[PDB]
Amino acid sequence: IRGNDVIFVLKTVEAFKCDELERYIDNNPECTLFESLRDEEAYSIVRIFMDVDLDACLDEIDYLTAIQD
Amino acid sequence: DLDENNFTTVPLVIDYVTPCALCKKRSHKHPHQLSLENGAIRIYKTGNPHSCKVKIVPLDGNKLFNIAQRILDTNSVLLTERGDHIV
Numbered sequence: 001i002r003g004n005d006v007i008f009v010l011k012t013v014e015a016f017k018c019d020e021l022e023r024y025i026d027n028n029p030e031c032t033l034f035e036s037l038r039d040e041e042a043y044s045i046v047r048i049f050m051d052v053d054l055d056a057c058l059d060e061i062d063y064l065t066a067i068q069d
Numbered sequence: 070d071l072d073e074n075n076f077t078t079v080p081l082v083i084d085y086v087t088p089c090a091l092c093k094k095r096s097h098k099h100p101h102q103l104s105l106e107n108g109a110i111r112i113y114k115t116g117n118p119h120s121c122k123v124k125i126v127p128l129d130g131n132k133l134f135n136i137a138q139r140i141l142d143t144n145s146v147l148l149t150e151r152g153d154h155i156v
């Protein structure tokens with residue numbers, strides 16, 4: 001694989017590079033793009049990611065210790 | 070300077086001989102600070118919060134554990150290389 005430098009996005013589609021995506025984001029701040037996989041079988045190697053949502057507000061100290069743990 | 074009644078009031082000032090034991094920084098913007106939360110002492114620097122990671126020290130209790138710790142502090146029980154304790 002040797003890595004991938006192409007990012008496929010869906011508007012609710014495009015295949016942009018790092019500079020291309022940066023320029024498009026700078027031009028359109030309100031555009032809603034979702035990063036996905038252009039081909040599941042070809043480049044299934046991806047990073048490790050997680051999404052966290054807690055409907056409350058925390059101070060700096062509590063957030064720091066909680067994120068460390 | 071920090072007593073039993075003023076432990077969290079006076080921020081603790083440290084020396085700069087060695088870098089921070091928590092973040093390896095030579096010098097920090099502000100001195101450290103101690104706070105109490107659920108029977109645990111949190112140690113953290115003021116000013117830049119992300120500069121220093123928060124440390125935690127618990128004051129647990131369990132009288133029998135304290136007694137065991139104190140008896141170990143006197144250094145009366147030892148473990149020989151053969152695996153048998155000497156007192």
Ligand SMILES: [Zn+2]
Pocket residue numbers: 089090091092093094097114120121122
């Ligand atoms: Zn530090």
